[PDB]
Each structure stands twice: as structure tokens, then as C-alpha cells.
Amino acid sequence: SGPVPSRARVYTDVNTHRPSEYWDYESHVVEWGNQDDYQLVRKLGRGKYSEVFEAINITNNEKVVVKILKPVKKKKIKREIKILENLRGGPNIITLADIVKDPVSRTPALVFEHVNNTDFKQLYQTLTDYDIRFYMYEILKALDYCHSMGIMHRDVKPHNVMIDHEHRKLRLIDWGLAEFYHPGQEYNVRVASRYFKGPELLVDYQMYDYSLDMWSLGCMLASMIFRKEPFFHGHDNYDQLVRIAKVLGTEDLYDYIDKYNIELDPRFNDILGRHSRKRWERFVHSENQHLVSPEALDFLDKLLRYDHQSRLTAREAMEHPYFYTV
Ligand SMILES: CS(=O)(=O)NCCCNCc1ccc(-c2ccccc2)c(Cl)c1
Known part of the structure; x- marks a missing residue:
């Protein structure tokens, strides 16, 4: 049969119902x-x-x-x-x-x-739990908006987020990899930066959507609350999936590739191994405990899922209890 088709759960037909001039x-x-x-x-x-x-x-x-x-x-x-x-x-x-x-x-x-950007390598260890909630919400506003406009960014990462901390101003930049979402379209998987690449890209599942940006956002949130940059530190695209599998476990990886009938590349045979699913609390340490909370862990767990269809959309994410204080 080949791979099972997929489509976005939200804003599926926004470009379909628009004139050709738009897309x-x-x-x-x-x-x-x-x-x-x-x-x-x-x-x-x-x-x-x-x-x-x-x-x-x-x-x-x-x-x-x-x-x-x-x-x-x-x-x-x-x-x-x-x-x-x-x-x-x-x-x-x-x-x-x-x-x-x-x-x-x-x-x-x-x-x-x-945009008057404040330094990323300085804007760390001063940022509080509240600041992380605040800026994550500002990025979600950007994402819900571009997804509603039928666009996926496909290069969400800290280098593409500019913050003017003095004025509490955030801008999502570098739309060079961005694309129009069309349901059923097969996209190039050679997008995003290694550490931020979603499982769909690493297993070569071409029919991805907006949810790819939600994986990338999860990786940024994990690195921020756990003070581990990057969170998934692959040395190549194949190793990147292994680093994800060391956290999410190999059981759910096989559930994902079976659901979409994905053929796993032979290069994964000798490197994937077997890994248990890790608890998110395992990454809490003395250096990062002031930034972690049960709400943050519940939110992260809902973004970092192998199944692109099971991840929160940007609008569902904005409604999460992690953002009640914003
Ligand atoms: C030289 S340039 O074109 O200005 N680019 C350089 C961008 C610099 N990035 C700054 C940056 C981006 C994101 C986050 C972040 C905040 C909350 C949650 C997750 C991540 C932080 Cl702390 C800093």
C-alpha cells in the first residue's frame, strides 16, 4: 500500500477555499x-x-x-x-x-x-517561570495566526525568535523555509534545523502539516524549562531520531510508524535499539526546578508526541492551564 495519508486537524482547507492569487x-x-x-x-x-x-x-x-x-x-x-x-x-x-x-x-x-534583540546567551538564568510562559504564549499567537492563514513556518527555533525584553516584544522571523499548506500534498522533509526536526521529517513522512511547528515549539520549551540546549542533541538526522527515542521510547515510535504505514530506513536498524519511555520529572534538577511545574510538564507532554495528529494545535495550546497566569 505505501504510507497512509494524513491531513491537518485544523485550518485544513483554508487555501483550498481561497483564490489562486493568495497561494x-x-x-x-x-x-x-x-x-x-x-x-x-x-x-x-x-x-x-x-x-x-x-x-x-x-x-x-x-x-x-x-x-x-x-x-x-x-x-x-x-x-x-x-x-x-x-x-x-x-x-x-x-x-x-x-x-x-x-x-x-x-x-x-x-x-x-x-527589532532590538536582547542576547540569547544572556537572556537565560535571569528569565523566570512567568517570562517563559509569557514568551511561549507570544510565539503561539504567531503560530495560530500563520496556520490560520494556511502557512506552516517549518523553521521554528530560538535563532528565529527575536525578543526585545525591555519592551516585552517578540517577533517570529526567517520565513525562508515557510510553505502553503494544501491537504494531501507531499512536502520536502529537508526543512527545519536538526535539533528541531519533528519525527515525521526524520522517518521521511512527507504528508506533514502545521503540527510540525508544534513539535519544534516543544523542543524550545523543553530546552528552556530544563536548561538543556538543545534538548534532543542529535549528531546527524538518523541520530536525531535515536535521541528522541531515548526520551519518548521505542514502543510509541513503532506505534507511530505502524499507524501511518511508514517504511523505516535501513540506516535505523543498527542504531535505534530499545528504549523505555522516560518520565518528564527525570529532567528536573537543582539548576532548573524553579522553571518546572506540573502544568509545564503536562503541556510539554502534549507537544512532544511522535504522532503529529495527537499534538496540541496552537489554539488548543493557548487554552492550556500553563497559560492561566498570562
Ligand atoms: C541575530 S538575530 O537575527 O536577531 N537572531 C537571534 C535570535 C535570538 N534568539 C533569542 C531567543 C529566542 C527564543 C527564546 C525563548 C523564549 C521563551 C521560550 C522559548 C524560547 C529566548 Cl529565551 C531567546
Whole structure:
């Protein structure tokens, strides 16, 4: 038979009921601006096919962020531009302000609202249980919103979450891997960053949905409340599944792959082994006990499930008792 088909439990047909103009990014008409309105200040980082810079919009003396894209694949740039335009104004979503080209080098660049990020390697051991609840809820607002718009982010991780702690401002960034969800579509599993990859990706189950972002969110929450970064520390994509199996156990892994009739890659034969299901309390230690609670453990247990259909949706997650104090 092949693998059993699957579809999202929420926002299943949002793109189906919309015109082609919304989701057909290949037909989208991009109108470039003039990069002369912007003066580059400093480098903020470097990605696989992008260099991010802090800049000045000289026409109003306002700070902006400029992402210069290595134009490796045109279809992918068009996809990101369309999704960004589509999501513009959503809660906690980076705002694409302009799209410009270097008049001379002709390289594409995306211009965004400036976010004053506070350091990730400093924003730790000062953060409280309340702060973790607060920021997790702000990320869920972003996720429920983009999922409601028929988009899955597919690269949820701490590097893609910008926080201005002084102003308690959060922005979900880097929509370069984002995609339109269409029920029954088979997607490329070479998405997300290793530590944040959902079991569906590691077993090569192509018919995934929004729930993939919910696995990634669980990995970020686990690393935050247990002070273990990353939580699942795989050295490769095959080893990544083994690290998950050391926590969730091999019994539920076999239940998952049987339910979807997934063929497990021969490379897992000699590395998977047998593992018991671990209790979440096993990860509580003196360094992290002030951040852990029965509510946090119950919430995590509902996100970190092999079965992508059994994971909380972003809206069910926002209703969880872990967020009653927010
Ligand atoms: C250089 S750049 O483009 O600004 N990127 C760099 C991003 C820096 N990340 C900052 C970050 C992201 C997430 C969380 C987090 C908060 C609550 C729950 C889970 C995670 C924290 Cl503490 C810090």
C-alpha cells in the first residue's frame, strides 16, 4: 500500500477555499524598490543563503533590518516574499516593510521593521517561570495566526525568535523555509534545523502539516524549562531520531510508524535499539526546578508526541492551564 495519508486537524482547507492569487507564489508579481533609501549600518548575522544587516532608512531617520538574499533559487525568494506579504500585520510576525534590489549587483534584499534583540546567551538564568510562559504564549499567537492563514513556518527555533525584553516584544522571523499548506500534498522533509526536526521529517513522512511547528515549539520549551540546549542533541538526522527515542521510547515510535504505514530506513536498524519511555520529572534538577511545574510538564507532554495528529494545535495550546497566569 505505501504510507497512509494524513491531513491537518485544523485550518485544513483554508487555501483550498481561497483564490489562486493568495497561494500561487510563482505567479506573484514582485515590485522592487530603490535600495538608495537605505544605508547599511552593521552585520547582524549570516544564514545559508542570506546576510542580515541593521540599516537606516534615510528618508525618515528610522532603523530597519535588511536581509540580503544570495539569489540561489528564484522560486524560493518569490515564496518567502508572498508569504511575508500575506502575513504582514499578524501578531508577533516580522513586518516586511519593503523589497529592494541593489541597482548595480541586482541582488534581492528584504527590508523589515527593526527589532532590538536582547542576547540569547544572556537572556537565560535571569528569565523566570512567568517570562517563559509569557514568551511561549507570544510565539503561539504567531503560530495560530500563520496556520490560520494556511502557512506552516517549518523553521521554528530560538535563532528565529527575536525578543526585545525591555519592551516585552517578540517577533517570529526567517520565513525562508515557510510553505502553503494544501491537504494531501507531499512536502520536502529537508526543512527545519536538526535539533528541531519533528519525527515525521526524520522517518521521511512527507504528508506533514502545521503540527510540525508544534513539535519544534516543544523542543524550545523543553530546552528552556530544563536548561538543556538543545534538548534532543542529535549528531546527524538518523541520530536525531535515536535521541528522541531515548526520551519518548521505542514502543510509541513503532506505534507511530505502524499507524501511518511508514517504511523505516535501513540506516535505523543498527542504531535505534530499545528504549523505555522516560518520565518528564527525570529532567528536573537543582539548576532548573524553579522553571518546572506540573502544568509545564503536562503541556510539554502534549507537544512532544511522535504522532503529529495527537499534538496540541496552537489554539488548543493557548487554552492550556500553563497559560492561566498570562
Ligand atoms: C541575530 S538575530 O537575527 O536577531 N537572531 C537571534 C535570535 C535570538 N534568539 C533569542 C531567543 C529566542 C527564543 C527564546 C525563548 C523564549 C521563551 C521560550 C522559548 C524560547 C529566548 Cl529565551 C531567546
